[PDB]
């Protein structure tokens, strides 16, 4: 039918067999379920299959990319959307233990990851002299090799931007604690979890309410599942500045 | 007697007064492979409550910087390991993962009440550090069986000891 | 109980006027339970207060107490009850740890890795003024 027509009914049929909200099941379900309509429609010769596995397949923490909702309503439109729907803010913003964790690929020049480092940091901390309860975000690279993750770190340093990692010394281990401190440092401005195995190592050490915003554009980490996550997938890594 | 040669040691080269003015204090340190990790940290702990002056109440606060070498970096890695644990923060020009040498942290700990002394990993990270401190700068030295060289444009005091368990009384 | 308020009163600072108070920790051996339980009743009486990681009937050991008895300064000192006590509380403790031993004629096994003295007086009264 025509682009509106069929945009009230698809969500109707999802909508009362998940039973959940709306940003839920139109933004995080029916989002899903067009691409992969797409996908074995494009396949060459299995062009027909059966539904069965399909309900499954859309109900992922993630949320996929749509590169339909892409072309029609522009970056503009599509990052707003996004922005809206899982990331809602409030005016008092609680302090609590945010990752973000950010798919790092060669592709994505090393500019353009700061402007997103300040984005997420300026928009998720309270550094304030004044607050009794301050709070900033963790950062989470991957995909990535270490020279240029190294690269990105000892660049954010010398723009005044300081950070922790659980490393305070050359040759120390993990010390997971050093980026609790730095969640109530009003002087570290953000945490940076080197790779997975000091991710899941930082969960364990934190107690308040935890968040998890994931931005990747292939490949996602496996994430535990009772942690709140946001599970965003875009096109490029400057998309993710207009999201946080 | 016996003593004589730590008394020989002690107030002729390694003298303190009450007040000492901050300077720029450097140790450096003999850790070779016969020394056992744990009597270093007496002399570290030694070094850190003489030469340093934390306290709240002055507005010139320094702090001593340490210099090891004669060994591997599986045990002087080991050693820092301790040092953080027993909450005696320090600071190398390190502060995160894969960081280059940056000396300006050395000078911030020098000042902060709350960095108690300055580590130095090896000659290259010593040279670097050495013209980033502005104010005056002393150099000592304690050591069994190698001395290294020092810029002579620097106030140096050389001390060869027994072995490693003489230095913490010197001091 | 000489000796013990011999070490309360030298090796614990717990005035006001500082903010990083210290408490020594007391370790017994080569005794039965009988005389350790009473030597520990009458300091408690005496309002010499300790912390020996039980802190109720029927408690497993709780190295935490002895965490926060350390700093606190209405707690004069720790008592730790056996060997196993000893060993869980050294873990317990992250920052540094001096171990002084005063033995006559036993001495007690300690990890390597700690700043030990062992002295051999004659008996238990030459203890005192040493400390």
Not at 22 to 44: G, P
Request: charged content about 30%; proline content about 3%.
């Amino acid at each position: 039918k025509s682009f509106d027509d069929q945009k009230k009914e698809t969500i109707q049929i999802i909508k009362n067999h998940f039973q959940c909200e709306d940003y839920e099941a139109e933004h995080y379900l029916y989002s899903n379920a067009f691409r992969k309509t797409y996908d074995i429609s494009c396949n060459k010769k299995d062009r027909r299959i059966k539904k069965s596995d399909f309900v499954e397949s859309i109900n992922k923490s993630k949320v996929l990319f749509n590169i339909w909702f892409y072309q029609y309503e522009g970056r503009k439109e599509y990052l707003r959307k996004l922005k809206e729907s899982f990331i809602r803010r409030s005016v008092n913003t609680s302090p609590y233990a945010r990752f973000f964790i950010l798919e790092f690929q060669d592709k994505t020049d090393i500019k353009t990851v700061k402007d997103c480092i300040y984005k997420i940091q300026s928009n998720w901390s309270n550094l304030s002299k004044r607050t009794d309860r301050p709070y900033s975000p963790f950062l989470l690279f991957h995909g990535t090799s270490d020279a240029n993750l190294y690269e990105l770190k000892n660049q954010l340093f010398n723009e005044d931007l300081i950070f922790t990692d659980g490393y305070p010394f050359k040759g120390s281990v993990f010390t997971p604690k050093m980026l609790i401190e730095g969640f109530s440092n009003k002087e570290i401005h953000f945490q940076f979890i080197n790779d997975i195995d000091d991710f899941n190592e930082t969960l364990n050490s934190i107690n308040i309410r935890k968040e998890v915003y994931q931005f990747y554009t292939e490949n996602c980490l496996d994430i535990p599942s009772q942690l709140p996550q946001v599970n965003i997938q875009v096109k490029d890594f400057a998309d993710i500045k207009e999201i946080v």
